[PDB]
Amino acid sequence: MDLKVVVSLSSRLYTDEIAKMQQRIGCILPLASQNVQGLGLGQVYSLETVPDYVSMYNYLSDCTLAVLDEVSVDSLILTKIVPGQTYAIKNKYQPFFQWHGTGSLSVMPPVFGREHATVKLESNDVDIVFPMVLPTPIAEEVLQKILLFNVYSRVVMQAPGNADMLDVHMHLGSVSYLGHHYELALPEVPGPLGLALLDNLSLYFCIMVTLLPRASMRLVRGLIRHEHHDLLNLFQEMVPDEIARIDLDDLSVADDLSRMRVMMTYLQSLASLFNLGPRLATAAYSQETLTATCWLR
Amino acid sequence: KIHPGVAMTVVRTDEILSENILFSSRASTSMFIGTPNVSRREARVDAVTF
Amino acid sequence: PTIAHGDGRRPSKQRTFIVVKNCHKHHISTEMELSMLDLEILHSIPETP
Amino acid sequence: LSAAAVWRAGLLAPGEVAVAGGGSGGGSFSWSGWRPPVFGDFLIHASSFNNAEATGTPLFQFKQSDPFSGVDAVFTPLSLFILMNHGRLTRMANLLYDSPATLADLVPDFGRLVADRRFHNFITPVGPLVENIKSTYLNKITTVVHGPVVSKAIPRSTVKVTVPQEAFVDLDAWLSQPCPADARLYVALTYEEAGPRFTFFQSSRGHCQIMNILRIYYSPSIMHRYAVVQPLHIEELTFGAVACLGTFSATDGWRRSAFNYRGSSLPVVEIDSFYSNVSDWEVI
Numbered sequence: 001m002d003l004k005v006v007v008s009l010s011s012r013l014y015t016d017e018i019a020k021m022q023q024r025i026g027c028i029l030p031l032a033s034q035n036v037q038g039l040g041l042g043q044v045y046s047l048e049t050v051p052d053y054v055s056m057y058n059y060l061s062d063c064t065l066a067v068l069d070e071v072s073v074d075s076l077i078l079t080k081i082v083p084g085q086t087y088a089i090k091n092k093y094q095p096f097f098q099w100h101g102t103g104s105l106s107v108m109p110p111v112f113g114r115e116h117a118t119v120k121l122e123s124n125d126v127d128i129v130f131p132m133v134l135p136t137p138i139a140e141e142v143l144q145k146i147l148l149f150n151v152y153s154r155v156v157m158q159a160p161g162n163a164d165m166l167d168v169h170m171h172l173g174s175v176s177y178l179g180h181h182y183e184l185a186l187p188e189v190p191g192p193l194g195l196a197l198l199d200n201l202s203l204y205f206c207i208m209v210t211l212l213p214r215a216s217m218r219l220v221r222g223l224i225r226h227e228h229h230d231l232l233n234l235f236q237e238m239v240p241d242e243i244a245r246i247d248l249d250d251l252s253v254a255d256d257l258s259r260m261r262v263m264m265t266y267l268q269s270l271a272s273l274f275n276l277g278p279r280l281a282t283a284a285y286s287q288e289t290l291t292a293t294c295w296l297r
Numbered sequence: 298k299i300h301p302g303v304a305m306t307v308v309r310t311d312e313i314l315s316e317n318i319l320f321s322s323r324a325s326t327s328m329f330i331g332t333p334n335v336s337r338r339e340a341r342v343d344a345v346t347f
Numbered sequence: 348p349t350i351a352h353g354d355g356r357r358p359s360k361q362r363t364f365i366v367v368k369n370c371h372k373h374h375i376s377t378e379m380e381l382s383m384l385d386l387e388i389l390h391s392i393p394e395t396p
Numbered sequence: 397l398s399a400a401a402v403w404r405a406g407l408l409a410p411g412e413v414a415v416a417g418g419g420s421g422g423g424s425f426s427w428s429g430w431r432p433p434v435f436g437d438f439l440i441h442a443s444s445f446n447n448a449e450a451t452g453t454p455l456f457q458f459k460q461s462d463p464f465s466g467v468d469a470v471f472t473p474l475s476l477f478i479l480m481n482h483g484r485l486t487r488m489a490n491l492l493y494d495s496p497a498t499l500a501d502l503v504p505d506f507g508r509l510v511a512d513r514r515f516h517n518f519i520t521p522v523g524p525l526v527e528n529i530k531s532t533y534l535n536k537i538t539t540v541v542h543g544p545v546v547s548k549a550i551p552r553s554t555v556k557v558t559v560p561q562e563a564f565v566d567l568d569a570w571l572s573q574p575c576p577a578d579a580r581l582y583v584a585l586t587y588e589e590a591g592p593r594f595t596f597f598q599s600s601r602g603h604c605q606i607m608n609i610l611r612i613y614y615s616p617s618i619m620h621r622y623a624v625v626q627p628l629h630i631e632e633l634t635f636g637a638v639a640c641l642g643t644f645s646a647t648d649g650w651r652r653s654a655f656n657y658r659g660s661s662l663p664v665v666e667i668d669s670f671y672s673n674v675s676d677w678e679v680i
Binding site: 340341 | 398399402403406428429430544545546554645669
Binding site for chain 4: 001031032033058059061062063064080196197200207210211255258259262265266268269272273275276277278
């Protein structure tokens with residue numbers, strides 16, 4: 001088995017950028033199959049396009065990732081990602097994330113700003129931006145946040161008396177972490193592929209809203225009329241009118257089984273939609289030297 | 298079969314398979330030959346590939 | 348070198364050029380294949396036809 | 397030469413070996429790696445079989461609902477498609493089999509299992525067939541269930557995988573350059589008002605992103621449903637399910653050959669160097 005895939009440049013890499021490519025050693029880069037362009041994320045995320053973070057998500061998920069370990073002039077060595085090998089990955093990204101959780105790892109587009117993952121290359125007509133590496137809970141939280149932002153910023157733009165544009169950019173806003181809050185990069189238009197993702201998500205939503213187990217309605221009504229739980233704080237002691245008007249019928253068990261059957265199958269389908277982008281299973285991330293043995297799941 | 302009131306400059310490409318005669322001077326470039334080193338790839342279902 | 352002239356031109360004072368040339372490093376990779384079913388017998392010795 | 401001199405390290409033995417010392421570390425000489433697959437052996441009725449079909453054909457086991465049966469037969473999508481046509485390409489399908497009676501009554505309920513639309517979780521793919529004895533009774537077959545395809549015997553021959561071209565739909569030819577290294581092969585269930593269908597999908601993209609493009613391709617088949625029917629007794633909202641059969645090498649593409657019966661001709665898509673990996677069923 002081979003992992004060593006060498007990529008030549010085409011012109012003399014200047015000595016001002018060999019220092020920062022020495023600084024970016026052990027990071028991850030997306031492949032194309034060699035050539036120089038597309039070996040990175042500049043070809044689908046440029047300055048011209050509004051960053052949708054979904055077409056570049058399509059490119060990074062659809063293509064096998066690659067580790068960049070050695071940079072020389074006119075030649076730099078890459079290493080592919082093939083399942084069954086436990087790659088050594090160093091967390092070398094300026095929005096810092098300690099892997100104290102030691103969970104599964106995730107790759108994402110550079111949603112933390114263009115500057116943090118870019119590198120200029122004045123040798124050839126190619127520029128390289130880098131994919132972001134970040135743990136599973138932050139990645140899925142930022143994923144649902146960027147989808148909720150690109151679906152609600154547009155409807156806030158649809159408001160004629162849009163008195164509060166800055167409401168969602170400071171409430172949604174930053175990312176949830178105990179160490180700090182790290183502000184991200186926000187598009188204004190969702191792009192085509194983002195609305196395709198929200199289209200399939202809303203399709204799953206309207207299919208699953210046709211079947212609700214009616215016993216659970218009674219449980220949340222009873223718990224609202226019990227003590228207000230800390231998990232129940234989002235209701236602030238209120239029964240919504242909709243759950244009051246879909247409980248006109250009684251409690252059954254015959255429809256409940258097939259309801260739950262189609263709910264299991266459609267939640268597994270939704271999980272297959274949201275397990276998108278390539279994933280890493282981690283064994284024993286070493287803390288003192290910032291390296292992690294990980295294999296492709 | 299009438300004129301449309303519009304004249305048309307019509308470009309066209311053309312691939313010519315020529316044969317080129319290379320000339321270089323004596324000892325302009327100098328080659329450096331490394332040693333051939335072997336390595337192995339993924340072992341296919343029929344064979345291994347060196 | 349330069350050339351002294353009779354007229355007063357702004358005289359070039361011992362210009363020294365230093366150019367450098369970098370190596371065009373590029374490599375060659377071949378692809379041999381071999382099936383392993385006859386490679387166990389190259390290290391051993393034959394006794395049956 | 398110096399190539400024969402550098403040959404001592406690159407001769408054999410994946411991994412390496414510490415040649416001497418206080419202890420010996422690593423032994424892998426006289427074994428060139430290349431992990432052999434595990435073999436899922438089945439015993440089928442010979443009346444459920446056709447001997448004339450080629451070896452490398454992707455099979456589908458229906459698991460028996462019966463406890464008092466050591467045996468279990470198999471379904472191929474040709475046999476499955478003529479079974480859908482009997483429960484209700486056909487001229488190809490009748491050319492193979494004479495009697496669909498023991499195959500339709502082999503499964504206890506077939507109109508009921510399409511009535512509840514739960515046909516996907518009862519059909520477990522066991523990948524391509526390789527090993528096949530021939531008997532008039534209780535014929536035993538063996539398929540490479542996970543890993544690379546290979547014959548059983550010490551001649552460890554590659555087995556090209558025959559998938560029927562008429563039942564196979566390309567993805568990228570209908571979509572008209574993310575990753576040409578991985579080449580994955582998917583099978584997909586497909587329901588219809590006339591009769592259900594099994595189809596195959598070649599894809600060069602990853603596994604998880606392939607379903608969302610499959611929905612975009614598959615949307616004119618779902619626009620015809622729900623105009624004439626409306627589901628009661630609630631099932632039927634699922635419309636097909638997809639799973640992974642495995643991967644193959646995109647360096648050598650699929651070369652179409654001729655799997656011929658004596659009746660007529662039938663073109664087939666041959667998959668060579670297939671790396672079988674049966675995953676789980678993913679609905680759309």
